Design a protein around this ligand. Structure first.
Ligand SMILES: O=P(O)(O)O[C@H]1[C@@H](OP(=O)(O)O)[C@@H](OP(=O)(O)O)[C@@H](OP(=O)(O)O)[C@@H](OP(=O)(O)O)[C@H]1OP(=O)(O)O
Ligand SMILES: [Zn+2]
Ligand SMILES: [Zn+2]
Ligand SMILES: [Zn+2]
Lengths: 143, 107, 48, 254, 167, 290, 34, 299
């Protein structure tokens, strides 16, 4: 019933303290995944998923880099099994990109004029206080 | 069929968008000068500051929340952190409501 | 030969119909002089 | 003329010029990539659209239909990667339409040739010793599902189940030392730059013990001929001639 | 979903395609509907190819649910590929298929009569499905451009309309 | 199919910023009149304004000489019926299906032989802009056109999208008003468009000089003259317009009284000058004297 | 108004034009000959 | 004829002739340097490569034997017109080196103006710097004086500056331009120097042993700037007869030294003209514009 594991390799042994957090997070992902398509909207019914996804990888990003509270081996096992997100992480590690909402909000080809979401514009340079809801992620100004 | 440079057009457009004044684009055969078109007095008083150029602005930024510890199960607002000075419901009220009912009946 | 064959190419590329879709050409820039001139329009610029 | 004038002039022009000639918008710079979505995105879209009967969608109707022209590609791409009985689960890269209209498995199954033949040779031995030593073989029923039983959901029905041991042959630790660990993997040495090109998976190079065990393992699916004069009048040219003369050798085609 | 959207766009409400891709009428149809509701070899070739793939993926789903076995899955797949003639009914619509069909018989006589060379018996448990799989994959390599052309024509004619002006 | 280089649009509808960014889509939609497929151009009018779209073929535009989305005339800018009436035009574009498709086909074939420079047909033979047309014309850009629609949710209360409600969360307009229901087809054909009738009544109530009863009342009173005018200047106002017989420049009341030699000449002069004879910046009031 | 219909017989075929070679009868020789 | 040349992928910023009048060099955003033959069909033979940044200024030597080319990527480059290959990569510039000038008829020596706040003097042979006059700020154009002993530079603070190579101090500072100067070019007189500046005015100066102490000689009207602030460059004719300028107005401006009249505002271009080149032999004009191509006008 968990993210049943493909490796068949033994998990390295920090796995036992990050186990329950990831487990309840996957509980929350399954639940917010099934949450059925109410009179909510058709653009915004996919905002939970991106939200949760960021969370999980964010969490592991902490416990390896900002706490150094897990090993390289355990962290790599946790990427390989699809808890984390290899490139969301490898993007987070850049300099202008600490809080990037979803990896698609910087895809230049997915938008006709060749730009990023207004998600990506610094809040100051707009200064108009206008609510921003990037249609992709639902984020409100990732950076 | 013009061919112009790319950073500059978006710079001028965003200027005119968020500040309200812009370096007018007329490339006239009578030599005009650099004139700030739109909110001319705004360009004068704001020193021509562009939305892209950093500039001193003490403008009160709207208050927002910040819950960025991703271990709380229902905690992480992260990048999806709502604005703190925001409303919690959006609706029209008693007078406009009955008036809209009256209009939907009139239609 | 030139005009002939280019029109050929379009008519036969219709008969490709499985269009090996090429990229969209780079964004063009066009400079436009309206007929109506007036300072109250175009926020006072005589071109767009 | 005013100095602070010139100073914020240097400020403005510095920022402007700096961004305008930033390496980002250099000439031939091409934007980096399109990296992967999460799987739940696909899963949710497709389970949402369901069978396009709810009028809430009603516009993906047209694209849904128009995508029929390409479904013989999706089928071919799907069936050419099926998971090969020594495996329980195979994960594949999937390219899909943002409305769930179609789903192309986006991959080509490269294999190492001697590895592959050895794996299928082990299958030969296992299948045979199993069919000999099973009391009664039950043949599944076709079709396995009824005419109006709707298809199952992955998420509700297969997503969390445990996947039922596959047809490994159990390799002996001494004689098959050089292969016992990586034999039954999907793409065996995918990420070890000593033996494979890289992650695009061309170009193997192997050790001679590796090759000897592989050989012995695939021994069942193999010819124990050593040279070519076995096919004396039984090669391509003999057949080309016979066909040309309309005469036919004993065991050859007509 | 695609084939049902086609059926119901042509306004043919009296037919329905069930979940194993059988097409069945839910009334008895007068002549006008027996005519209006005839379909072509594009529709039916697509139907039958999808039926083959559903047979395959559903054998795999049975494996993954716990219903069968590794050996029963392997032999059932071998079965599927050897007997496409009696399970799909594809030959009706592109009769050149029998090339492939005869090939997957010849292979089976080889493999079987080398599989059961000793105490191994004439029973079901022989799944060595590489050969027939290869055969139907090459068939698909050939058929996809054909079917993409035929289906492009059908969809065009359904959305633009048929050209009776300068035939 | 049409194929264009740019839209052809009113300055009101094109926007405010000098720098606009606009997208093209080849063979994107069907002209609501020409009924054939067109290329469709979409631009963001301004900050917090709805994206607008060209909604009529380039030929369906050049024929009647209008703005492909704003639909108002190109020079003056009034509804198509008003402009037609002010030009005294009689536009004979067919209505029924087959006749209209046939007329469109041949009009397009003939407009293919043009220069792309000016409207085809009587729209060149009717460019004599009458003072009624100039008088009804809009002056500055009525940029209230580009704000978004009315939020059914926020009209019932439901626009729970916060401030992002996709439509102006204001009061819905009472549907009884004539200025509510104006179908595109009629507004292009000019048959019973309410805005046209309201604007025509407004033009009928607008001030114009009145004519007298008697033919012998050939003295015309111009009120509000001022002492910066000359008798020769009043002449030059009413000299080549016909013949003037006499001119009394009353300086004790700042007015003038012009006796003419031709009744139609003076009538044309004074009516054409009604409150709008602006010589040296004086609002003279042209009327027939006692 | 270009259709997306298509034909079995409008597939590409014989896509190169043969030109009359040096010995067959090229316009140069026949330009010469008596 | 008009003879428009094309084959450049992005803006061409710099175009100039062989000092022979034999071959053509042009360069710009595309980070490479194209060469052509001026006569015949105006055809392209060679393309020099290597510069990672935009080629902001190419400059010949006075024989035509080695090529200097200032790049955005903090570097100048000298190459062999014989081969097209790099001999030297003048590195060490701490920012955008926009302007380059090889000493003419003196020892081989180079002055480079840059966006670091320094003007730099370099010897080609040593791979080391000679002198550097950090005034305060970006220097946008630089040219020597025919003695190879003063160095003139124009930047953002509008006061054209000249250093003495031996005392190394601000020798000559001249004033009168209302906004940033964008181009200097000293005529073949060795005396008269031409200055474009986007304030819409062009000026003429003269560096001599003795000058009136306020050497603002001739003044012409016509040049334009706009939101582009592209770098605008001027030149004298081989004779000191006509001044040619470009501008962001799509008009090639040809004026005269004598009557300062507008001999030409020629249209023909699509984007801003960044550089006009005079033939050292002929009445041939080559326009490099931001419309990604060039023009070959004959007057
Ligand atoms: O039904 P088919 O396509 O004709 O294949 C079967 C079958 O093969 P499957 O095992 O895949 O059903 C039999 O196999 P066994 O009975 O051997 O297990 C058998 O083949 P045998 O002849 O070897 O029995 C039989 O053939 P027949 O009816 O002649 O017995 C026949 O294969 P054929 O193509 O040989 O008919
Ligand atoms: Zn976004
Ligand atoms: Zn996002
Ligand atoms: Zn974001």
């Amino acid at each position: 019933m968990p993210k049943v594991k493909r490796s068949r390799k033994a998990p390295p042994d920090g796995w036992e303290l990050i186990e329950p957090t990831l487990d309840e997070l996957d509980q929350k992902m399954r639940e917010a995944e099934t949450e059925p398509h109410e009179g909510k909207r058709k653009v915004e019914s996919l905002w939970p998923i991106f939200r949760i996804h960021h969370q999980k990888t964010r969490y592991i990003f902490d416990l390896f880099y900002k706490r150094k509270a897990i090993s390289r081996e355990l962290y790599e096992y946790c990427i390989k099994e699809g808890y984390a997100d290899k490139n969301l992480i490898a993007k987070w590690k850049k300099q202008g990109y600490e809080n990037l909402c979803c990896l698609r909000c910087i895809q230049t080809r997915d938008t006709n004029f060749g730009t990023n979401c207004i998600c990506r514009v610094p809040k100051s340079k707009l200064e108009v206080g206008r609510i921003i809801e990037c249609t992709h992620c639902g984020c409100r100004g990732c950076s | 069929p013009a061919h112009i440079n790319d950073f500059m057009f978006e710079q001028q457009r965003r200027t005119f968008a968020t500040y309200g004044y812009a370096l007018d684009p007329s490339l006239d055969n009578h030599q005009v000068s650099a004139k700030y078109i739109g909110s001319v007095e705004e360009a004068e008083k704001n020193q021509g500051l562009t939305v892209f150029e950093t500039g001193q602005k003490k403008t009160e930024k709207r208050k927002k929340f910040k819950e960025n510890d991703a271990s709380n199960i229902d905690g992480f607002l992260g990048p999806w952190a709502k604005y703190v000075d925001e409303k919690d419901v959006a609706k029209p009220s008693e007078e406009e409501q009955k008036e809209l009912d009256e209009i939907t009946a009139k239609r | 030969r030139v005009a002939l064959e280019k029109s050929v190419s379009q008519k036969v590329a219709a008969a490709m119909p499985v269009r090996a879709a090429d990229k969209l050409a780079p964004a063009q820039y066009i400079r436009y002089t309206p007929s109506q001139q007036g300072v109250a329009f175009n926020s006072g610029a005589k071109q767009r | 003329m005013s100095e602070e004038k010139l100073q914020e002039k240097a400020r403005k022009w510095q920022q402007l010029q700096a961004k305008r000639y930033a390496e980002k918008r250099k000439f031939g710079f091409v934007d980096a990539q399109k990296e992967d979505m999460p799987p739940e995105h696909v899963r949710k879209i497709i389970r949402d659209h369901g069978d396009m009967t709810n009028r809430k969608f009603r516009h993906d109707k047209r694209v849904y239909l128009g995508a029929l022209k390409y479904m013989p590609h999706a089928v071919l791409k799907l069936l050419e990667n099926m998971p090969m009985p020594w495996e329980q689960i195979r994960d594949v890269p999937v390219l899909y339409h943002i409305t769930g209209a179609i789903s192309f498995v986006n991959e080509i199954p490269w294999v190492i040739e001697p590895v592959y033949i050895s794996q299928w040779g082990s299958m030969w031995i296992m299948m045979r010793r199993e069919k000999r030593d099973r009391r009664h073989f039950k043949r599944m029923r076709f079709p396995p599902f009824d005419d109006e039983e709707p298809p199952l959901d992955y998420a509700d029905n297969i997503l969390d189940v445990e996947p039922l041991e596959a047809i490994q042959l159990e390799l002996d630790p001494e004689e098959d030392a050089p292969v016992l660990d990586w034999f039954y993997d999907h793409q065996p040495l995918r990420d070890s730059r000593k033996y494979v090109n890289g992650s695009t998976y061309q170009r193997w190079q192997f050790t001679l013990p590796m090759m000897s065990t592989l050989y012995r393992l695939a021994n069942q699916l193999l010819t124990d001929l050593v040279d070519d004069n076995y096919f004396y009048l039984f090669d391509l040219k003999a057949f080309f001639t016979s066909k040309a003369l309309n005469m036919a050798i004993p065991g050859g085609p007509k | 979903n695609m084939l049902n959207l086609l059926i119901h766009r042509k306004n043919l409400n009296y037919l329905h395609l069930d979940y194993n891709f059988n097409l069945k009428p839910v009334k008895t149809l007068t002549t006008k509907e027996r005519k209006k509701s005839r379909f072509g070899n594009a529709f039916h070739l697509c139907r039958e190819v999808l039926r083959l793939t559903k047979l395959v993926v559903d054998s795999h789903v049975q494996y993954r649910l716990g219903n069968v076995d590794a050996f029963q899955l392997a032999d059932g797949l071998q079965y599927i590929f050897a007997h496409v003639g009696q399970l799909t009914g594809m030959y009706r619509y592109k009769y050149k298929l029998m090339r492939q069909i005869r090939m997957c018989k010849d292979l089976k006589h080889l493999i079987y009569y080398r599989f059961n060379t000793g105490p191994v018996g004439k029973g079901p448990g022989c799944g060595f499905w590489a050969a027939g799989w290869r055969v139907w994959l090459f068939f698909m390599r050939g058929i996809t451009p054909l079917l993409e052309r035929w289906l492009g024509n059908l969809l065009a004619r359904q959305f633009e309309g048929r050209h009776s002006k300068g035939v | 199919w049409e194929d264009a280089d740019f839209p052809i649009l009113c300055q009101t509808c094109l926007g405010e910023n000098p720098y606009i960014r606009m997208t093209k889509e080849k063979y994107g939609k069907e002209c609501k009149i020409c009924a054939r497929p067109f290329t469709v151009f979409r631009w963001c009018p301004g900050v917090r304004m709805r994206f607008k779209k060209t909604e009529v073929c380039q030929t369906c535009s050049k024929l009647k000489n209008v703005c492909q989305t704003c639909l108002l005339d190109l020079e003056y800018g009034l509804p198509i019926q008003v402009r037609d009436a002010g030009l005294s035009f009689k536009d004979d574009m067919p209505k029924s299906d087959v006749n209209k498709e046939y007329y469109t086909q041949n009009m397009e074939r003939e407009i293919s032989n043009s220069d792309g420079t000016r409207p085809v047909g009587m729209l060149g033979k009717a460019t004599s802009t009458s003072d009624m047309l100039l008088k009804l014309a809009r002056t500055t850009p009525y940029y209230k056109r580009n704000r978004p629609h009315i939020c059914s949710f926020w009209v019932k209360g439901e626009c729970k999208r916060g401030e992002e409600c996709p439509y102006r969360h204001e009061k819905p307009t009472d549907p009884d008003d004539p200025l509510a229901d104006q179908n595109i087809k009629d507004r292009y054909y000019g048959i019973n468009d309410p805005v046209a009738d309201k604007l025509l009544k407004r033009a009928s109530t607008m001030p114009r000089l009145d004519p007298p009863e008697d033919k012998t009342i050939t003295t015309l009173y111009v009120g509000g003259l001022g002492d910066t005018i000359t008798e020769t200047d009043l002449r030059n106002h009413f000299y080549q317009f016909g013949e003037i017989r006499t001119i009394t420049v009353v300086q004790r009341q700042q007015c003038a009284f012009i006796q003419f030699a031709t009744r139609q000449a003076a009538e044309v002069a004074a009516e054409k000058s009604f409150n709008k004879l602006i010589v040296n910046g004086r609002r003279l009031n042209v009327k027939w004297g006692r | 108004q270009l259709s997306k219909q298509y034909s079995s017989r409008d597939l590409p075929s014989h896509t190169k034009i043969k030109y009359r070679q040096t010995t067959q009868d090229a316009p140069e020789e026949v330009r010469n000959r008596d | 004829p008009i003879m428009l040349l094309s084959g450049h992928e992005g803006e061409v910023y710099c175009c100039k002739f062989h000092p022979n009048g034999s071959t053509l060099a042009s360069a710009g955003f595309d980070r490479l340097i194209l060469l052509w033959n001026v006569y015949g069909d105006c055809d392209n033979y060679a393309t020099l490569k290597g510069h990672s940044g935009a080629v902001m200024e190419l400059h010949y030597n006075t024989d035509g034997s080695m090529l200097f080319s200032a790049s955005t990527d903090k570097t100048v480059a000298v190459w062999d017109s014989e081969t097209g290959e790099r001999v030297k990569r003048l590195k060490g510039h701490t920012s955008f080196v926009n302007s380059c000038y090889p000493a003419r008829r003196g020892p081989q020596l180079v002055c480079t103006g840059s966006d670091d706040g320094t003007v730099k003097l370099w010897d080609i042979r040593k791979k080391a710097a000679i002198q550097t006059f950090q005034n305060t700020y970006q220097v946008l154009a630089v040219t020597f004086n025919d003695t190879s002993d003063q160095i003139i530079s124009g930047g953002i603070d509008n006061d054209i500056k000249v250093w003495d190579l031996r005392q190394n101090k601000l020798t000559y500072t001249m004033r009168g331009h209302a906004d940033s100067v964008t181009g200097l070019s000293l005529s073949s007189e060795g005396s008269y120097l031409l200055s474009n500046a986007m304030d819409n005015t062009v000026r003429v100066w003269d560096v001599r042993p003795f000058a009136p102490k306020e050497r603002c000689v001739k003044i012409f009207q016509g040049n334009v700037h706009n939101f582009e602030k592209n770098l605008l460059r001027c030149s004298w004719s081989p004779d000191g007869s006509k001044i040619a300028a470009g501008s962001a107005d799509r008009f090639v401006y040809v004026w005269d030294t004598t009557s300062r009249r507008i001999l030409y505002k020629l249209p023909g271009h699509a984007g801003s003209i960044n550089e006009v080149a005079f033939h050292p032999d002929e009445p041939i004009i080559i326009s490099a514009s931001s419309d990604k191509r060039l023009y070959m006008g004959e007057i």
